[PDB]
């Protein structure tokens, strides 16, 4: 039995990379060499967003492009009005060990979790005027590495137990588990339609999942080291990943392979976080060495640097209207850039 | 300032009242000793947690001579340690548990597994500055076993007696020789048993020496 199944697995691995290689008629570079460069991206820190007292681990924008949640190891989930720098809420976490946070597409909820193995869902819009824990999504057996809401009742969460899970929040219940990663899953990105998501893991692999059918559609494997960061390109047909390889990589869904890589010889450090600009033309990546690099996503030219942090950039988010990027850091600050 | 509406002014006032509570909770959090509790599965962690108190992180709180201690047992986590061990970079001291009785027990040898774990934690890039409290947790059952079975089960390289003194001291040195970075790190080893107060006093002693040495870095004397 097992030797024949292993031969058939290796034979399918030959057939699938042969099918990818048959698609590879020209590389993205050959198609974008004739396009004009971005020029220098010279963003300025327009806001510094100060009240966290430990490392920022995560942030997420609201869909309004004005509120952002952020989470730090001081056990606070802070909601910021980015325009005024006002703290809208500071939410005391039951476990300080938060590694991720998400803000619902409605702005009604924030989610967070980490080394507690729980994704806590916080209702922002109570009649009581405090923020309350509405649900605790217990059922992962390793740390919560990522959360993303699909809507007020559906959240996809990623874990150190090597699984993603989709939850029904009102039942408190993982309605789907996604199991095919062999390493700890570190990151999620929902597709723009929320029918798909990608997750990147410590087996240096990214998997595309169908949310509704509960299955891995595609696996992507060009990274030499563990994927910390993942983001859909804004069309939903491709995604970027960032890893401890000190590379980002852009992968097609439709052609099922790597298009391009984003690295410079003087970049030697793990990519913590990844985001696209609204047109997808800029790929923003956050690093240890304490900065964010902006890439021409079409050329892989390093288009600019967001050099304002004193410790590891742990987070990025571009706003949904594309106006700004917020970058979060282990130095305990969030900086907003334009 | 005239540029802010009556509601903007009340939102800035709320934001500043949130700052006042964040800053107050930071003052509370700064006076708390963060302790990361490590060691292999049966290493005596639970005996330590009982004495100190008397899946996911088990965070336990104790108070001793007005230091407040938070103990993070990361033992129930089963996941890739280099993805989350950097959460603990701001820890005061690691407490590392070793079952001293496990020199002649199987995982392939448990004492060598404890040493490989200790080496990887001790010499970690996130903990270069961070001291370690070793608890060698089962000195009674080690005295019962050492009379029956030699340390040569773990260390064929050894050449002392199967008396408690020479065997226990050799094991302590077999862990403390795993320190690289001796310029910036200290190990506070303590032989441990069924004992209510002395182990908690040892954490307080070793943590006070660690805080003094952190303060002496913060003012250039160390």
């Amino acid at each position: 039995e097992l030797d024949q199944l292993r031969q058939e697995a290796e034979q399918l691995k030959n057939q699938i990379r042969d099918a990818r290689k048959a698609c590879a008629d020209a590389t993205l570079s050959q198609i974008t060499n004739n396009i004009d460069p971005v020029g220098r991206i010279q963003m300025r820190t327009r806001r510094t967003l100060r009240g966290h007292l430990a490392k920022i681990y995560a942030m997420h924008w609201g869909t309004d492009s004005r509120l952002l949640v952020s989470a730090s190891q001081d056990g606070k989930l802070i909601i910021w009005d980015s325009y005024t720098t006002n703290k809208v809420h500071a939410i005391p976490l039951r476990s300080s060990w938060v590694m991720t946070c998400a803000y619902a597409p409605s702005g009604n909820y924030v989610a967070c979790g980490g080394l507690d193995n729980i994704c806590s869902i916080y209702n922002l819009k109570t009649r009581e005027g405090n923020v309350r824990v509405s649900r605790e999504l217990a059922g992962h057996t390793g740390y919560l590495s990522c959360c993303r809401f699909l809507d007020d009742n559906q959240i996809v969460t990623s874990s150190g137990d090597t699984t993603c899970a989709l939850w029904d929040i009102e039942t408190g219940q993982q309605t789907t588990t996604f199991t095919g990663h062999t390493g700890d899953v570190m990151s999620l990105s929902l597709a723009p339609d929320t029918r798909l998501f990608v997750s990147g893991a410590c087996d240096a692999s990214a998997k595309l999942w169908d949310v509704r059918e509960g299955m891995c559609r595609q696996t992507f494997t060009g990274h030499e080291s563990d994927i910390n960061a993942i983001c859909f390109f804004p069309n939903g047909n491709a995604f970027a990943t960032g890893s401890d390889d000190a590379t980002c990589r852009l992968f097609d869904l439709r052609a099922d392979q790597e298009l391009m890589t984003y690295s410079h010889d003087n970049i030697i450090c793990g990519i913590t976080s990844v985001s696209f600009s609204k047109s997808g033309r800029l790929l923003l990546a956050g690093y240890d060495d304490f900065n964010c690099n902006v890439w021409d996503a079409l050329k892989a030219d390093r288009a600019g640097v967001l050099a304002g942090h004193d410790n590891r950039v742990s987070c990025l988010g571009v706003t949904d209207d594309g106006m700004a990027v917020a970058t979060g850091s282990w130095d305990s600050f969030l900086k907003i850039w334009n | 300032g005239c540029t802010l509406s009556a509601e903007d002014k009340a939102a800035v006032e709320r934001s500043k009242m949130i700052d006042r509570n964040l800053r107050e909770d930071g003052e509370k959090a700064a006076r708390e000793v963060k302790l990361l509790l490590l060691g292999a599965g049966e290493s005596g962690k639970n005996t330590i947690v009982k004495q100190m108190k008397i899946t996911g992180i088990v965070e336990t709180h104790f108070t001793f001579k007005d230091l407040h201690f938070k103990m993070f047992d990361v033992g129930a986590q089963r996941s890739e340690r280099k993805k989350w061990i950097h959460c603990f970079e701001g820890v005061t001291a690691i407490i590392f548990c070793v079952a001293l009785s496990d020199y002649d027990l199987v995982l392939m040898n448990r004492m060598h597994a404890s040493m490989k774990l200790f080496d990887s934690i001790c010499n970690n890039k996130w903990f270069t500055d961070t001291s370690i409290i070793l608890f060698l947790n089962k000195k009674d059952l080690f005295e019962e076993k050492i009379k029956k079975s030699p340390l040569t089960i773990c260390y064929p390289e050894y050449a002392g007696s199967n008396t408690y003194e020479e065997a226990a001291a050799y094991i302590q040195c077999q862990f403390e020789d795993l320190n690289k970075r001796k310029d910036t790190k200290e190990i506070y080893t303590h032989f441990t048993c069924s004992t209510d107060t002395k182990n908690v006093q040892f954490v307080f002693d070793a943590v006070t020496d660690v805080i003094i040495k952190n303060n002496l870095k913060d003012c250039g004397l160390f």
């Epitope: 405090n130 | 509601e7 009340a10 009242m17």
Partner: single-chain antibody
């Protein structure tokens, strides 16, 4: 959520009463609190404000120095110590919640009121109407105007619309000119130019009977319209 209110009944002119308002079922310390007066058969008048954590206090000039707003967060209680009462103070006083952050709904909850019977350059809000006799099912379009533009430099327009039903305390319908409150049906909608404003009740119902007040929140003192009643 409640605001239950006591101190009231008869008092002589020159006299004094402590109004109190005990909050329950909400995070009282995080809310700013207002008192709003309503003189018998007259409109709403804002009296006093105390912010969350007492850091800001405001009064109407009709009560400034003469009334003091006080607050006991550990007792979830709000007070109005009225030190030198006059016939012009005879009213139902409503304790009112407000909370201020981006996208919040201030004035969202009003207590049942307490009645005080004293024995015997502000932004002007105008509704250019007093009563409207009308029938269920059809649309209604109440309107208001301000002496100053309520459209601020930040892009908010600070109208609030309140409905007060007969024998009941006011209820927030619309906050910040466009936005309808929690538990208010989509039948109510708000619009305006920055100086003129409309509340549309798109399909009227028998529960919509009552006095409708605009209020500005651009500047203190807060000022209400005179109120327009809808009746069957």
């Amino acid at each position: 959520v409640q605001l239950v209110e006591s101190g009231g009944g008869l008092v002589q002119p020159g006299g004094s009463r402590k109004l109190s308002c005990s909050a329950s079922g909400f995070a009282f310390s995080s809310f700013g609190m207002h008192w709003v007066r309503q003189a018998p058969e007259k409109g709403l008048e804002w009296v006093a404000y105390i912010s969350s954590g007492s850091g800001t206090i405001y009064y109407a000039d009709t009560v400034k120095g003469r009334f003091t707003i006080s607050r006991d967060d550990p007792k979830n209680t709000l007070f109005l110590q009225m030190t030198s009462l006059r016939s012009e103070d005879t009213a139902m006083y409503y304790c009112v919640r407000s909370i201020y952050y981006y996208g919040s709904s201030p004035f969202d909850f009003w207590g049942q009121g307490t009645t005080l019977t004293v024995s015997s350059s502000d932004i002007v809000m105008t509704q250019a109407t007093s009563s409207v006799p009308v029938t269920p099912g059809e649309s209604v379009s109440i309107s208001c105007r301000s002496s100053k533009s309520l459209l601020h430099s930040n892009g908010n327009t600070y109208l609030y619309w309140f409905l007060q039903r007969p024998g009941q305390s006011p209820q927030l319908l619309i906050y910040r000119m466009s936005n309808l409150a929690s538990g208010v049906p989509d039948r109510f909608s708000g619009s305006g130019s920055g100086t003129a404003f409309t509340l549309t009740i798109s399909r009227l119902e028998a529960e919509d009977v009552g006095v409708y007040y605009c209020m500005q929140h651009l500047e203190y003192p807060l000022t209400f319209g005179a109120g327009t009643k809808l009746e069957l």
